[PDB]
Design a protein around this ligand. Structure first.
Ligand SMILES: Cc1cccc(O)c1
Ligand SMILES: Cc1cccc(O)c1
Ligand SMILES: Cc1cccc(O)c1
Ligand SMILES: [Cl-]
Ligand SMILES: [Cl-]
Ligand SMILES: [Zn+2]
Ligand SMILES: [Zn+2]
Lengths: 21, 29, 29, 21, 21, 29, 29, 29, 21, 29, 21, 21
């Protein structure tokens, strides 16, 4: 999930936007 | 574990901003 | 409006802490 | 929703738990 | 300035990018 | 006043995220 | 890189507070 | 009310930074 | 208290130091 | 030392939330 | 104190509540 | 810059004040 993805590596605002509703 | 807990606090702040009116679920795995 | 955006920011940080491993949902109005 | 309920009045931590998964 | 523009109304992320270097 | 100080705090956090490597400028009123 | 991204978020919050009406530029290098 | 809760959040972050090793006390109204 | 003093008006960092240990 | 300084910022935010009207002392050792 | 306890290991909201007044 | 200086080592409020305008 998001912790694995974005706490091991920076995520941009576009990568983050995948987790949105 | 603390590092992860700290990171997650910023993650949710960032989703809050990026998702806007859409909202989001936060499900740490 | 802005005040609501501000409020929301703090609610997500509080849900992050309260809900812990369960995670949470944030759906604005 | 949580904004109506918790931005117009202050929510306990108990009340906030309603929005936990 | 950014306070006038974005504290009196809510700014998109696009609008915020105006204040990026 | 205070409300503006509060608003500003959240704008800088949002500019930090939005602007990324470009960085940003914050000039209050 | 995440550690640095997290640190930077607090840095800007701190400059916001310390600089006050002067404002600041945030230029990460 | 909520506005005070919001204000308080930012005051504690500012006392954390200002007071440094002395630490601080936070007593709401 | 600090809320009365610093939520109704803006406190300098000097004024905030009053609430340091 | 920075890691600890960052952690402490979130600690105080968390006490602010958890302690509520009781308030708290922050004394880092 | 709290830094030793909760920055070396996560503390829940119940563990944190010990440091309250 | 500031990331090099203050993310490798703590900076006080006085060290931070150099980066101000
Ligand atoms: C915005 C943000 C916060 C935390 C981690 C990331 O990878 C991205
Ligand atoms: C809520 C919180 C913040 C920081 C560290 C912890 O262990 C707990
Ligand atoms: C205030 C602050 C934040 C982050 C790093 C520092 O060295 C100082
Ligand atoms: Cl952090
Ligand atoms: Cl606020
Ligand atoms: Zn942090
Ligand atoms: Zn706020």
């Amino acid at each position: 999930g998001i912790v694995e993805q974005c706490c091991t590596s920076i995520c941009s605002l576009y990568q983050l936007e995948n987790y949105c509703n | 574990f603390v590092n992860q807990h700290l990171c997650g606090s910023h993650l949710v702040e960032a989703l809050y901003l990026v998702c806007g009116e859409r909202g989001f679920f936060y499900t740490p795995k």
